[PDB]
Amino acid sequence: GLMQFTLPVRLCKEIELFHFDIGPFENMWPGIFVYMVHRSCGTSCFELEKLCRFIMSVKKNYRRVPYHNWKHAVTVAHCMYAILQNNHTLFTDLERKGLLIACLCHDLDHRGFSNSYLQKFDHPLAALYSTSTMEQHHFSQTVSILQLEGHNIFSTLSSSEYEQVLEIIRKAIIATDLALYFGNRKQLEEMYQTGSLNLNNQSHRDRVIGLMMTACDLCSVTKLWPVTKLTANDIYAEFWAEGDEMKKLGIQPIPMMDRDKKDEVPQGQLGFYNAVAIPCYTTLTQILPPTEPLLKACRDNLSQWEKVIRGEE
Template sequence: MFIDLNLVEKFRINHEVLCRWVASVKRNYRPVSYHNWRHAFNVCQSCFCMIKTGGLESIFSDYEKLSLLVSCLSHDLDHRGTNNAFQAKIEHPLARLYSTSTMEHHHYNQCLMLLQSEGCEILSHLTSSEYAHVIKLVQHAILSTDLAIYFKKRNEFFNVVKSGAADWLGNDGHRELLR
């Protein structure tokens, strides 16, 4: 998927580094029944299919495509199979650290950690401003997977589509909803 979207070439991602990063992401999923590596891979492949067959290849920038694939594979990292309400009720340290979107903040944090791990730095050829841009997109994408946020954004998205005034290229707000 990274090769097909030309991201490996565009961002000069070393093949071995990419493989090591993917293997590390896989290893940091737990063997829970749903939020496991298979789920992350499925989400990534669905996103890839939407980009390839939904006409999004010419709408999203390379930075956005890279961010989306990284986010999809990373969005449930270290999931324990329990939801945010559960973390709050058992007063888990993570719930004290992040009072809202508890698990999503943790997934994002794990994602950042892996991107910065030695030998897994797939973004190492980006300039500091490019890196900051990609990370911001990744953060937004992963935090948006909190269902409490997702359903609100989903409604907004459908309203934009139904209004017939969707402008994916010119309107940053619309584009953000699409991502």
């Protein structure tokens, strides 16, 4: 009850910042997450015995893939913590609980392959879930872990609060499907500009939480350049492996996934920042002004990719 997690001074201070990197010490990541739950939600939100057992089972069900791994889970949860802490009064007790767990669980059992590769392979998960294939799997895996004996961190919620929190987590995890992001942001753009955006409208909150999830999910483009640049290697190691596996099905992959076309990556990163990342953090900044540091860091990293192309690095 009276047992806080306390981080070393440099982490205690930097963890409050959007651009915080959780570091290379894996054994510190569970404590970093509990710390964030305690400050974001409260020390009463979860039974520490159950939370700790939930965290370690979530960890175990992330695979040793280059990018979509346990470190990504905790990184995405930290970005959400930073958004919730800079927007104190906009989010309910249930939403603060649901969203940190949602981010931690959002890529459970990822194999490092896209929804497209599952469909072209004809993977069983592509027959069980026709759209947002991996994301429905990620939510499925979250529910499984919640139902392990001693793992139900939500046991103290009423029946109706329990249903609301699982519904928040489900929508949050589905929203991490980048194919759904484009239409969600376009709708949020219209609503903000015509002035119809209303945070008491549940369908509107849903969309705003969706954008937050995309923002947290892409947060590696909002770090200091060296973090962003070295994380890019990890994401491309998965892309190129998927490209290799496309060639083994006798399908030439898109150039982004073809390790024979590494030269095209700087230009492909520009397209990604311009088409996806910058618009995402722009709309998020309009809806939640205190999240402007994410947009600023993202523009700084666009400029750094522009310098790569111009041969300045």
